[PDB]
Paper text:
Protein synthesis in mitochondria supports bioenergetics of eukaryotic cells and is executed by dedicated mitoribosomes. To provide a representative reference for studying protein synthesis in the mitochondria of fungi, and to reveal how the mitoribosome functions in coordination with its translation partners, we determined structures of the translating mitoribosome from the representative fungal model organism [name]. The fungal mito-ribosome consists of 78 different proteins, 23S and 16S rRNAs.
To further improve the local resolution, focused masked refinements were performed using the masks for the large subunit (mtLSU) core, central protuberance (CP), L1 stalk, uL10m region, the small subunit (mtSSU) head, body and tail. Protein [name], which was previously partially built as poly-Ala, has been identified directly from the density as a helical repeat protein consistent with mammalian counterparts. Placing an ATP instead of GDP leads to more favorable interactions. In the mtSSU tail, we found an extra density corresponding to helical structures of protein chains. The density and the mass-spectrometry data suggested that it is the natural inhibitor of the [name] ATP synthase [name] bound as a homodimer. It is also bridged through a metal ion Mg2+, coordinated by uS17m Q162 and the backbone phosphate of h44 A1745. The topology of [name] homodimer is such that the C-terminus of each monomer points in the opposite direction: one towards the mtSSU body, and the other towards the solvent.
Author numbering:
A (entry chain NN): 2 to 113
B (entry chain EE): 56 to 180, 236 to 287
C (entry chain JJ): 81 to 268
D (entry chain CC): 17 to 171, 193 to 369, 403 to 508
E (entry chain ZZ): 42 to 219
F (entry chain YY): 55 to 100
G (entry chain 77): 223 to 401
Write the structure that this text describes.
Amino acid sequence: SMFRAKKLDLGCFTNVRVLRDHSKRKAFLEAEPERQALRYVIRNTTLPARTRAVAQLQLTQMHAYTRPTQIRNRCILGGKSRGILRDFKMTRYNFRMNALMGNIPGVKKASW
Amino acid sequence: RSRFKNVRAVEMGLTSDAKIESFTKKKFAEYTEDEKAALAHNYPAEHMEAIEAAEAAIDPKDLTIQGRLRVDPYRMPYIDDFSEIQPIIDKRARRSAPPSHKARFMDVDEFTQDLINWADEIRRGTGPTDGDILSYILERSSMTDNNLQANSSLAPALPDKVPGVEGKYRNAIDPAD
Amino acid sequence: EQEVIMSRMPRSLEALYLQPLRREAEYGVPSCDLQLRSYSIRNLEFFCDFALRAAYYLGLPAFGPVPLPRMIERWTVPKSHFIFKKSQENFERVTLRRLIQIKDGHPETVQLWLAFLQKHAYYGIGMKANVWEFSKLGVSKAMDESKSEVEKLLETRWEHLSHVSDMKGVGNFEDFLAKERLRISGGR
Amino acid sequence: SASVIFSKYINNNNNKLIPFKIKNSDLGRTRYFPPISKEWKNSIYVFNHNNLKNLPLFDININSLIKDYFNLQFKDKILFKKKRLSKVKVVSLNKIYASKAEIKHTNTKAILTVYTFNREKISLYKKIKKLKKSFYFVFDKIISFSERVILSGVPVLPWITESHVNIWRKIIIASLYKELILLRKYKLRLDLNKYKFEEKLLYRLNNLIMKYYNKKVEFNIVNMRSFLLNSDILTKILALKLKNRNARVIKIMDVILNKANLPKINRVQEKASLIKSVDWNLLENKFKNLNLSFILNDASYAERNNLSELLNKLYYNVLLVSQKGVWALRSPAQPKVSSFAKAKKYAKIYQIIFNSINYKNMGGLRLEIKGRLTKRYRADRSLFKVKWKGGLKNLDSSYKGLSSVNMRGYAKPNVEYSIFTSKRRIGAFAVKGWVSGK
Amino acid sequence: EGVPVPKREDDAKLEFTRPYNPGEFLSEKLRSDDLQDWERERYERALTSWEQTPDDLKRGWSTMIRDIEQAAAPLRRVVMPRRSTFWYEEEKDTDLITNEDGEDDFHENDIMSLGHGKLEEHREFREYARIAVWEMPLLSKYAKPFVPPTSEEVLRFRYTTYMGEFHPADRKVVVEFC
Amino acid sequence: IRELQKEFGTLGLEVDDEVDDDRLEHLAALRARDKGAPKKKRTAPS
Amino acid sequence: DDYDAPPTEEEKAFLRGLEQGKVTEYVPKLTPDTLLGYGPPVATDAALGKVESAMRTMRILGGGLPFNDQSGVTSDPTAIKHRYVHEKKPVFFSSVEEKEWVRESLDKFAVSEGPEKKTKQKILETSVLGKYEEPKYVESLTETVKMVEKYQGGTFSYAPSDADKFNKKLNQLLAAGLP
RNA sequence: GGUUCGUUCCAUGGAAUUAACGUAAACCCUUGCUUUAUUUGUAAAUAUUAUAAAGCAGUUCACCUUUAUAUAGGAAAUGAU
Ligand SMILES: [K+]
Ligand SMILES: [K+]
Ligand SMILES: [Mg+2]
Ligand SMILES: [Mg+2]
Ligand SMILES: [Mg+2]
Ligand SMILES: [Mg+2]
């Protein structure tokens, strides 16, 4: 909740979990270098054992929003998390409806 | 080593460069002194600069060795100089000044003064004619922008009778009903 | 005040009704490879003819348009948002592209050609150019001596930029460009 | 000498020579290639697709701005109109209707096309035009007359300053206040309707849309003479009519179809096929050897050397007074135009241009209304009405057998489909509309 | 706050409630209610001047403003919508109500939206034809001939451009030498 | 639309928010027939 | 009886002139200056390619919009005044006419003629001269700090601020794991 | 009543004449051929793989059979293609 901006800054389809996933994307952007440093000290077997253990503990205390594995694309029109296409940021269905109306540039019904 | 073939040049009897020069000077001769003056008298200065640079760039030998007629689907279906911008077949021109950011719609005071100013312009240029009143309703600006004529983004209208659309309709509504 | 009977029309106007002329390359060393792409074929073929006519006036021997392989993406999606799965349909996005390669082109002249195409670019077409150029050893010193040359050319161009005295919103100059460039490109 | 790195790119010359082959086969006329902007709403290509994934969403936001932009109206206090307050929300049909926007993208700017049916101008122009000429004729006298008595002695001068003009003007306003505020009303409402299409008010909308594409947007607003020539504007109008509870659904559809005028046709000739025969008038078949070294070399005509003489025989030339005559020029601030631009007659060019355009005439019309449209406030069942006039066929291919170019792989190039969703006080309904062209 | 209430305070007062002729108008302002004294001499000089004018002219002025009211009469006349109307069936702005006759007749002076796409395409072809006939030839005045590299120019660099786009791959430089 | 209204509001132009004006119309209808929302509770239940 | 007279022929001729348009003038104009700003920003030996890479840098400072000197001179004066005064960031104008229009729109708003001397040097320092920070060669694998700076210097993914966050945390970890 | 892959076509009916959708046509891939283009693909090349824009092509011609004389059909590695 501390990562949710007090003023909404989303122009797409807003949802309880779209705000949740948008907050994780902003938190990871702010703490990716700090996180890469810890992940480097841990995997660096040339450092002292204590140094690697300190970084290994600090990486466990970082908030969950800072983990990139918790970022899952969503549909900017419907807000689902299943069936999303990276090239369009939409579900397979909203891609079909917009593709047939001509709202996705370059896409056309395939036949060969 | 050349970029094209000679099969199409030898057939016409242009195997030697001496004969190619005769064909060029005979078919693609350059403008004479008389035609340059006449051509320069009708077009303005800037246009003549493009014509002079064109005949200096495009050499007649290329037209004789590789000059081919255009049969693409994108070629222009008619001949025209394209020197000026035409009413219907060209994009509307944008020659006006930019709008004023501080301009506002006239109030009763400002509106009356302008209406008085318009009466003086048409009078200093019987009473106002139908053409003047028609211009006041459609051209006279009602904003405090010194009677500006901004650029219209409205696409050019079509002819009063579009070829291919005229003569095919008949209004069903009869004013007698 | 007499009437003159023009024997013909200006060559600039006649050349518009002939196929685009082409200069001949004496050596054939590629100086630029312009690749044009679009999702339609009609605007791609039109602008490729326009690009060849510009290369002729500049004295650049152009070659092409070479039809490069089509880039075809494919997606199969269910026709129904809910359960129905035995009914799907295929979609695609075919990218049509052409290649115009210039040979024996002067480096500066090739940049006027590219500058001209960008100013008069046709909508719906994406373009990418690879420029080649020969240079001598000692690039470090060459780029330091040309400083005074570029400064003179920019004397009249500095007017485009303007900022308050000691611009503070920028902060670290280099970090500003690196981060402002990402914001312009949308992430990368 | 030269460099070795340079020589390593000269030897790589295994090019194929341009043969200039002579065609020996007959060529047909190419298909009608419909415009590119009519296949996808956004005509764009970019190498970085980050500028390509948000377009579907922006189209919704942009269309909302444009819809609300064209609905701007003065405040009742500006025009001094007495607002008639009421709880009910009035539906306004006499405004500017707009269709979905089509955007042509470059790396430098974006051209936003939108078809509009200006219904407010039809009313304002006729209403203000009722003010007879005597108004402006008499108003001029008051100006001159007033200057003879107020700004002059009893029966431009250096003894008339603005301080006196102010008082001289207020006297006119005090006597014609009820008349000036009237003319000012229609004058401002008409000018507002006019500036919506000019840069006076569009430069502000540009600042609002420019924030979505990060490029200056140029507007190309096309004024439609009839609201039936665009499906988007049609389903919008029909939807506003049906939103009222007391709206007669079937009756409204019949009035719209009655307004649709279809051209006269011969059913037997339209549905008649075409026999494929070589067209020797096509420039491809007339000259099977396109090289000028062969055409201009005294092939058929006697001394047609000049390339222009050849072109004048093929194309229509405007520079000539006689179509197959000669180009005779005249030999011995103002606008910079040729001395013959005024004599040019674009009478047959309009025929060439507009005859090369397909799908101009309205061919067919189809309307569908589906949803909760009953008049009573209860849980009745959904309705579904369908009306049509003409046909949505692609005559060029279904009957003549010519080859067409389908849009997006499956769609006919001559039909426009648009859907508009609304809601009554009892539920939601939709209005679908098809419009075909001949 | 709370349940919103209608903003009933919305109106604009008219500067004049009834037409004041030059005589009455100047009299009201000269009553010294709210006005600068150095300006009253102007109004006072105007009032006395108006009074000095003949009587018939004053009468002519009255008739000169009555006809204007007669000329503006058809503009403020409220028009009744047609019995079977389509556009003004629910329009409550009486200013826009018109006779509605012939407002939907097709005069064969417009094509479908699909045609405008092909017409606008022609306006674009004329734009490029205009450039290729008048602006392209000027490119030849600034063109430079190609000179082959000398024995010292041994490096061959490559630079990438995306023609107005920002792409992460336009920063790479490739060099090749023998 | 709010930034559209604030942009042209300086010129004296107005435009209704059909989306928001409809939302408010719906809420007013609920309160009319006694279906609106209860009073927000600001304290724990006790 | 109230009837609207048909549009007079004079009226039609007047309306067609406004709707269809009029025969206006077109003056060709093309020079290397009218093309400057649209050219390819390549670090070639030709000064034209270097001037374009400098113009590109000024557009990134001024907001990042493309160089468009053919779509008008208007802009958003309020947004420019905010960026120029409150945010204190540069502003790029595609033409002097665009700069004068902003002065007229705003009341009592001044803009500098050009960038300061320092800003001119920073633009040429990297985008034209191409001065970099050569990543040194680290021999020992135990030089954690030196080796991190090496990789950071050889990749544009790590902005100067990103390397700061990385180095701040790294130095903290190396310090805590010592006696 | 015939005929057709087919409400296809023909003939016919003391009742029919037409419209829309589906159908059909057209479209996409594929096959042969023509023209265009030649790099980042092609051994060479006097241009033939590949690449991809447009155009043409079939049940077309020949043979055989053929109702009510109106609309047709068959033969299939040993006619052409
Ligand atoms: K770095
Ligand atoms: K082939
Ligand atoms: Mg309750
Ligand atoms: Mg029958
Ligand atoms: Mg079918
Ligand atoms: Mg090669």
